[PDB]
């Protein structure tokens, strides 16, 4: 295999851990460092030119962080588990004025992951697909990233057909959480740009750099 699911799963395992908006932002900044470590352990990522590694993560980071804390939250009720160890409940999120986007994360991502019991190899592969985004602007070789995307979802199809043979639509189902992910990532990003613009919230240096 040019893209074995074993190594993608290891990537995930290797990086395994009062204003709620402040908490969320501390966690996000913490996990930005862990994101870079994760990406390097995805097969072939580190072999890309540094400029393209930068473009993919600049393009992907918000969706990659959202995919993690969503999957990490499956066993939680009406709330998310942060990397800091702190659970945030929808009541808290609503009371800080981020209820709507918070409800979207619960209903479109967390719930859907719990319902189908999305395993960690599957989270891995979805995040790998999101990382290898051939639509990212300025890539020196979009075909290369497209071909890496192709190898990830071919391995994912085969993992699903083998591991859950009883669920013939599981592969499609996994791929059909990516639009919601794109959508929630863009609304989250619009919120962080607002927290920044306003100076309501402490934005640590690496989060800050991803918002410039």
């Amino acid at each position: 295999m040019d893209m074995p699911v074993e190594r993608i799963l290891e990537a995930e395992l290797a990086v395994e851990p009062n204003d709620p908006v402040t908490n969320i932002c501390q966690a996000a900044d913490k996990q930005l460092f862990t994101l870079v470590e994760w990406a390097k352990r995805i097969p072939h990522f580190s072999e890309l030119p540094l400029d393209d590694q930068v473009i993919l993560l600049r393009a992907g980071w918000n969706e990659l962080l959202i995919a993690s804390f969503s999957h990490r939250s499956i066993a939680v009720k009406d709330g998310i588990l942060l990397a800091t160890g702190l659970h945030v409940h929808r009541n808290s999120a609503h009371s800080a004025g981020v209820g709507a986007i918070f409800d979207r994360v619960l209903t479109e991502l967390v719930s859907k992951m719990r319902d189908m019991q999305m395993d960690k190899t599957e989270l891995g592969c979805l995040r790998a697909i999101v990382l290898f985004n051939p639509d990212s602007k300025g890539l020196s070789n979009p075909a290369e990233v497209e071909a890496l995307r192709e190898k990830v979802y071919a391995s994912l199809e085969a993992y699903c057909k083998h591991k859950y043979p009883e669920q013939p639509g599981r592969f499609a189902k996994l791929l059909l959480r990516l639009p919601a992910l794109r959508s929630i990532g863009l609304k989250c990003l619009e919120h962080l740009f607002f927290f920044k613009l306003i100076g309501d919230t402490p934005i640590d240096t690496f989060l800050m750099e991803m918002l410039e």
Binding site: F33, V36, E37, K40, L50, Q53, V54, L57, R58, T205, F206, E209, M210
Partner: peptide, 13 residues
Amino acid sequence: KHKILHRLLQDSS
């Protein structure tokens, strides 16, 4: 000038 991202991405670890 993505200073912090560039530095984390070079480091061989």
